[PDB]
């Protein structure tokens, strides 16, 4: 019934029902829908937070990325909450805080097909519908938030 990846869950903390995508790690309160397959190409922006265990623990923001994986996840979760609240905008946060050179393009990576990005990033990107934002996506580079723009 629900689009690919989506499952109806309940919070262990709360008792509140929500919807979770196992492929993008996205969470939301709203039901995600009221032979299509997947798009052959998508365009995505992303915000990357690296940690000490990233493949290249360095960025234009700092030579020596020393935050732990848990601290990077906490930062990612904070950005997601700020975007969902309306306090901040995705592109603005990516320009300021993404540990990837695509920050200078406000996170934009352009269009791509399967087989071009790391598999977790690719799996999440192609499970997003246009306009949707992922949850935390773990790759060898670090933790990403992904926004599908096309």
């Amino acid at each position: 019934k629900l689009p690919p990846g989506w499952e109806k869950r309940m919070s262990r903390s709360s008792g509140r029902v929500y919807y979770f995508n196992h492929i993008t790690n996205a969470s939301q309160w709203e039901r995600p829908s009221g032979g299509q397959g997947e798009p052959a190409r998508v365009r995505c922006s992303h915000l990357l937070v690296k940690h000490s265990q990233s493949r290249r623990p360095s960025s234009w923001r700092q030579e020596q990325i020393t935050r732990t994986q848990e601290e990077a996840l906490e930062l990612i979760n904070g950005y997601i909450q700020k975007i969902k609240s309306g306090e901040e905008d995705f592109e603005s946060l990516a320009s300021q805080f993404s540990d990837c050179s695509s920050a200078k393009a406000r996170g934009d990576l352009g269009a791509f097909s399967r087989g071009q990005m790391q598999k977790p990033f690719e799996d999440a990107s192609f499970a997003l519908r246009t306009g949707e934002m992922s949850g935390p996506v773990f790759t060898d580079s670090g933790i990403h938030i992904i926004l599908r723009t096309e």
Partner: peptide, 4 residues
């Protein structure tokens, strides 16, 4: 840097 998310390229394969």
């Amino acid at each position: 840097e998310x390229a394969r």
